[PDB]
Amino acid sequence: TXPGVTXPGV
Amino acid sequence: XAXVXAXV
DNA sequence: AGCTCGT
DNA sequence: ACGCGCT
Ligand SMILES: *C(=O)c1cnc2ccccc2n1
Ligand SMILES: *C(=O)c1cnc2ccccc2n1
Ligand SMILES: [Mg+2]
Ligand SMILES: [Mg+2]
Ligand SMILES: [Mg+2]
Ligand SMILES: [Mg+2]
Numbered sequence: 001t002x003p004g005v006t007x008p009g010v
Numbered sequence: 011x012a013x014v015x016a017x018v
Numbered sequence: 019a020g021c022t023c024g025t
Numbered sequence: 026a027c028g029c030g031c032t
Contacts, residue, residue, distance in 0.1 A: 016022090016024040016025070017023075017025025018023040
């Protein structure tokens with residue numbers, strides 16, 4: 001996720 | 011990712 | 019494949 | 026002294 005907590009996605 | 015001082 | 023902080 | 030969350 002995020003970043004943080006990429007995306008999703010990418 | 012860990013949160014032990016920052017928690018990002 | 020795709021990234022990030024200091025208490 | 027610590028690595029995290031789905032599309
Ligand atoms: C979270 O797992 C995590 C891991 N490494 C990092 C390095 C620098 C800043 C934040 C970070 N977070
Ligand atoms: C939290 O601020 C923090 C700062 N320095 C660290 C060094 C090593 C592990 C965890 C740490 N946490
Ligand atoms: Mg993969
Ligand atoms: Mg540091
Ligand atoms: Mg590390
Ligand atoms: Mg994991």
